[PDB]
Design a binder for this molecule. Structure first.
Ligand code: HEM
Ligand code: HEM
Ligand code: HEM
Ligand code: HEM
Ligand code: HEM
Ligand code: HEM
Ligand code: HEM
Ligand code: HEM
Ligand code: HEM
Ligand code: HEM
Ligand SMILES: [Ca+2]
Ligand SMILES: [Ca+2]
Ligand SMILES: [Y+3]
Ligand SMILES: [Y+3]
Ligand SMILES: [Y+3]
Ligand SMILES: [Y+3]
Ligand SMILES: [Y+3]
Lengths: 471, 471
């Protein structure tokens, strides 16, 4: 047994686990070191055009340390600026993979109630970031999945549930609670008080399998669309960090190497084994992350990975360039009078092209986890985009614009102008929210004892629209 | 020293090495077992359209055992039907990588003289297939490159020459004498008798590096073309088995694993080490070819390779389908009156598209040797093909044929009709050559003592146009 066999009071606050596991707590806290904000819309402006009419066209950055998950969820322009618990663009489900307070609330009010309402609904309740309670049982300390949607998805795909899985499998599944592709399923229900409510439930699109093509069929079957493209009016599908799905197809995954083997390597200290909880870039600690299975210069193994990234970059820029043009070209055809009937096939091609290319790059580590599947996906996506463009030339010609040249979008500024994103307005509105409602959420959380001010140190120094500079 | 330190009389005939190395001779002879003829034009008819106006549109099969190299060189419709030593479509250089008699003749008459004349010129001299003398010194038995063009290419690429290379490097370089991409360079010269002659010299296009892109620049720099496309009239480049070039970029090659490690694995017998000389498919002898570095089921490792092949097949069919259409679409534009000026950019795209896609698949093992580079190449080639097709739609529209649909070429028959290849005629002409001139070459070679009838056992049972069935 553990020294807390009856549970941990205040288990949602990771600082509560420190008295029992000082080592793991210390390394866990160090993800604070990965504080770099890389503006992906600035790096790859093509993404703005691809996501026109969707929140990702406003703000989308690379991931950083777990230490910042909760705050980045709050800072991103995607969550907008609620004025109370009933306003704001996004639903409560957006907290799901950002805090140990999520399973706390689910266990208190039930899954459906948790998935009911606006994101702003839990502003003063979900205030702790990725913590011990997200992956550990507070009585046994054993690995555990705290979200019901994972097993639900695993079963639907023919996989064993978390409890049915081996230990090595669990070392990757704890990650799969969040590092997977998903969609919100509108779900009607009635509470114990009889009132009718609508919940937006996190759902893993795995009922037909976990390959990109299988997930594609899954979405097409129910005619699902995350949004109607702001430019081409195409029924779009958004891929979101399908890290685990692509990892499973890669060689490492097929050979049984877990996420933890590379991101949370062990350090043996005479009979005692410790897992490095500083989840980050394995290439920064290759001796422990890689050289326990590989025998050769860290630099060469590093160079090899660098090569894979370049390959991915090459195909990525090609695919999204043609996807961007397809969108704009379709928008032009619309302006000239093209009918939805004349554009249906073109739109289906664009939908599939972006779904495949987005699935390939949405998982930032996929280029390494499953390099071959990534390249094949980008190639397949590009082909679908070009098929749409070839047909687009004819539609354009019919309407007298065969020589139309889609506008360029080589900078975030130009791309956002095409996507009609009024950044200044969104940022101004966001800051007002942060300076008012946000501070009230934190003050209330601290007063009620749900948040420890210590966890806020340096957590809000940066975002894509501001940088207080230092630490 | 060896038991033949002063050389081997009749060294070109591998049977002459048997008294000294019975083991190696026995396994070397067993490539006779790989006698399967796979008609690639039948399997991938798109290839016929791609090679319209070139010999490969007539006959192109997968490679088989070294035992059949010389005879397949004679059987392929590509070499046609000479009536004497001064007739026939191809030059003397076509023997180069098929026989140990090649270095024999080069060492006797000089490189330029060897590369001067028709293929038919040496019909009764080059009669032994891939043998000991192609890779071994007949005095020391050490590995050696017997063709000057290899070092010439290695140097030009900044690589060390064969003599300067390590032993492990030599275990791959002996293969690179033949398993590389090349082109024939028209070379003017004068013999010791003062007569002016023109030779077609095998040249490795490595002066700018060995990547596909570098080789592409190499060819474009000198405005080189292997042939003018029979359909699109595009200045085409033919990729030929760049096995070593792509292998060098793959992980195994980067890690120092030689061609021999997988294709000619060792078998330790108490202090004595023997190299399996039965060069073939490593997957048929995984225990010796792979499981000496890898530790897991042969079936899983086999399945993983099967997955790579499927990925390659997927992208290959897409790329060559669009390349085929581009060619046909260009041919249509020509019929309508499009000028060379209006088609120049389109043709450059097609040239580059096919060069990249052909380089990716011309090496039948590349999908495994360098899986990622193969996929990237097919993706890049497809993109170039689609860029050409997008521009082609506009040219077609200008000439009133925007709705033109390129004809299908899903069977070798239909594809060869489009490429205007009169198979029946070529085959009839070939058989007459085989029944007359060929038999005379062999009878004369046997009479002069250059060929041992034993080496002809079952060597001419199959081709792409006939199969005497059994052994
Ligand atoms: C499981 C052990 C697990 C792994 C592995 C994992 C990896 C991971 C990485 C490598 C990053 C980026 C780190 C960096 O850039 O320095 C990262 C980022 C996020 N993760 Fe994660 N993660 C694992 C588990 C979990 C779990 C259980 C959740 C969900 C509760 C989760 C969520 C996130 C979030 C959110 C981010 C983004 C952080 C930010 O940008 O603020 N991860 N993870
Ligand atoms: C709700 C739609 C939702 C929001 C909003 C949200 C935000 C968010 C941010 C701001 C980041 C940082 C990176 C960025 O700028 O985009 C981030 C990162 C990850 N998220 Fe998220 N997230 C929302 C929903 C979900 C859901 C339902 C899950 C879990 C199933 C989830 C998980 C993660 C993970 C993991 C990452 C890190 C890896 C990556 O590629 O970003 N998010 N999220
Ligand atoms: C939170 C600060 C936190 C604590 C505390 C904690 C403890 C803990 C222990 C005691 C172990 C076992 C011994 C060891 O160090 O290996 C352990 C192991 C793993 N943990 Fe953990 N852990 C904390 C947080 C987290 C979070 C946020 C996750 C999930 C993303 C997580 C995951 C893991 C994994 C995986 C292991 C290794 C499992 C194994 O190999 O048996 N921990 N943690
Ligand atoms: C398992 C399913 C698993 C998860 C989860 C995971 C996540 C993860 C993320 C989110 C990234 C991107 C981080 C970012 O900041 O962009 C990422 C990157 C890398 N990973 Fe990973 N990873 C999982 C599994 C594995 C395994 C099994 C290994 C080791 C073989 C591994 C390694 C890496 C590496 C390397 C990277 C890229 C580092 C870089 O180039 O910066 N991951 N992972
Ligand atoms: C650490 C982050 C790490 C790196 C770096 C790394 C690299 C690597 C490469 C380049 C390959 C080849 C396949 C490809 O190009 O995609 C590869 C293959 C295997 N690895 Fe690995 N690897 C890293 C970490 C680990 C760890 C911690 C293990 C051991 C549990 C491991 C194992 C393997 C295995 C097995 C393979 C499959 C191929 C094989 O060698 O049989 N790797 N890795
Ligand atoms: C070097 C040791 C070397 C290797 C490795 C190699 C491989 C190889 C394979 C795997 C095949 C196919 C075998 C089969 O299908 O069963 C094959 C085929 C040909 N090769 Fe080769 N080869 C090596 C060396 C050499 C050398 C030095 C030459 C040139 C003199 C050469 C040539 C060829 C030819 C020709 C073929 C095609 C045979 C046919 O289809 O008739 N190889 N080789
Ligand atoms: C001359 C232009 C020339 C001819 C003719 C020729 C023929 C030939 C045949 C018939 C095969 C069997 C496979 C097929 O049907 O195409 C074959 C195979 C290989 N060749 Fe060849 N070959 C010619 C020239 C050259 C030259 C100059 C070299 C060496 C630099 C060479 C090498 C090889 C190799 C190796 C193969 C096997 C691998 C493959 O992909 O076919 N050939 N050749
Ligand atoms: C021809 C029938 C032939 C003979 C005979 C022969 C002999 C031979 C010996 C004695 C060795 C060394 C001991 C061993 O078995 O490893 C050896 C090694 C290699 N050979 Fe060989 N060899 C014959 C033919 C060929 C041909 C056609 C090639 C080239 C394609 C070739 C290549 C090699 C290679 C490579 C080795 C291993 C080198 C090493 O690891 O030191 N041989 N052969
Ligand atoms: C080194 C430069 C090298 C050569 C030469 C070589 C050649 C070769 C050929 C011609 C093929 C295609 C054979 C056919 O009949 O289609 C081929 C195929 C495979 N090879 Fe190879 N190969 C070279 C090197 C290596 C190395 C280092 C390995 C082992 C890691 C290796 C393995 C294989 C495998 C596997 C195949 C594919 C088998 C199949 O799927 O049928 N080769 N090689
Ligand atoms: C035998 C023909 C053979 C097979 C099969 C094989 C497979 C294999 C795979 C699938 C990889 C992963 C990379 C990829 O997906 O492309 C891989 C990687 C390495 N191998 Fe291998 N391998 C075969 C043979 C051999 C032999 C004979 C050696 C040993 C000299 C060898 C070595 C390696 C090495 C090193 C790697 C690089 C990645 C790593 O594990 O560090 N392989 N192989
Ligand atoms: Ca999604
Ligand atoms: Ca060539
Ligand atoms: Y406590
Ligand atoms: Y990062
Ligand atoms: Y690979
Ligand atoms: Y003798
Ligand atoms: Y074969």
């Amino acid at each position: 047994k553990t020294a807390h066999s009856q549970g941990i009071e205040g288990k949602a606050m990771s600082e509560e686990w420190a008295r029992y596991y000082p080592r793991q707590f210390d390394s866990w806290k160090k993800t604070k070191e990965s504080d770099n904000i890389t503006d992906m819309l600035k790096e790859k402006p093509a993404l703005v055009v691809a996501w026109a009419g969707y929140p990702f066209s406003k703000d989308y950055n690379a991931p950083r340390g777990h230490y910042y998950a909760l705050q980045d969820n709050i800072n991103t322009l995607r969550t907008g600026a609620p004025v109370d618990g009933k306003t704001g663009p996004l639903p409560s489900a957006c907290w799901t993979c950002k805090s140990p307070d999520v399973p706390r609330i689910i266990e208190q009010d039930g899954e459906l109630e948790y998935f009911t309402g606006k994101w702003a609904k839990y502003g003063d309740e979900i205030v702790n970031t990725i913590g011990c309670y997200n992956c550990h049982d507070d009585k046994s300390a054993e690995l555990k999945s705290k979200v019901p949607y994972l097993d639900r998805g695993l079963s639907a795909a023919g996989f064993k549930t978390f409890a049915e899985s081996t230990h090595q499998e669990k070392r990757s599944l704890v990650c799969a609670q969040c590092h997977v592709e998903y969609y919100f399923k509108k779900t009607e229900w009635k509470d114990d008080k009889g009132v009718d409510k609508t919940a937006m439930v996190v759902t893993l699109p795995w009922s037909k399998g976990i390959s990109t093509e299988q997930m594609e069929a899954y979405y097409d079957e129910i005619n699902f669309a995350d949004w109607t493209h702001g430019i081409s009016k195409t029924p779009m599908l958004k891929a979101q960090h399908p890290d685990w799905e692509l990892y499973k197809t890669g060689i490492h995954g097929q050979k049984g190497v877990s996420c933890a083997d590379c991101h949370m390597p062990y350090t043996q200290e005479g009979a005692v084994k410790y897992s490095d909880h500083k989840v980050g870039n394995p290439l920064d600690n290759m001796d422990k992350s890689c050289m326990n299975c590989h025998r050769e210069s860290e630099q060469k193994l590093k160079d090899i990975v660098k090569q894979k990234f370049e390959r991915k970059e090459f195909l990525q820029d090609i695919a999204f360039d043609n996807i961007g043009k397809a969108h704009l070209e379709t928008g032009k055809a619309m302006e000239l009078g093209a009918t939805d009937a004349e554009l249906k096939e073109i739109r289906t091609h664009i939908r599939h092209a972006q779904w495949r290319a987005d699935m390939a790059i949405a998982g930032h580590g996929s280029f390494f986890h499953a390099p071959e599947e990534v390249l094949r996906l980008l190639a397949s996506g590009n082909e679908e985009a070009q098929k749409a463009r070839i047909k687009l030339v004819k539609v354009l010609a019919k309407y007298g614009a065969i020589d139309y040249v889609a506008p360029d979008f080589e900078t975030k500024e130009k791309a956002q102008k095409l996507a009609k994103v009024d950044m200044e307005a969104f940022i101004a509105e966001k800051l007002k929210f942060k300076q008012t409602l946000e501070q009230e959420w934190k003050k209330q959380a601290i007063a009620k004892g749900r948040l420890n001010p210590e966890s806020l140190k340096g957590v809000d120094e940066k975002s894509s629209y501001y940088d207080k500079t230092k630490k």
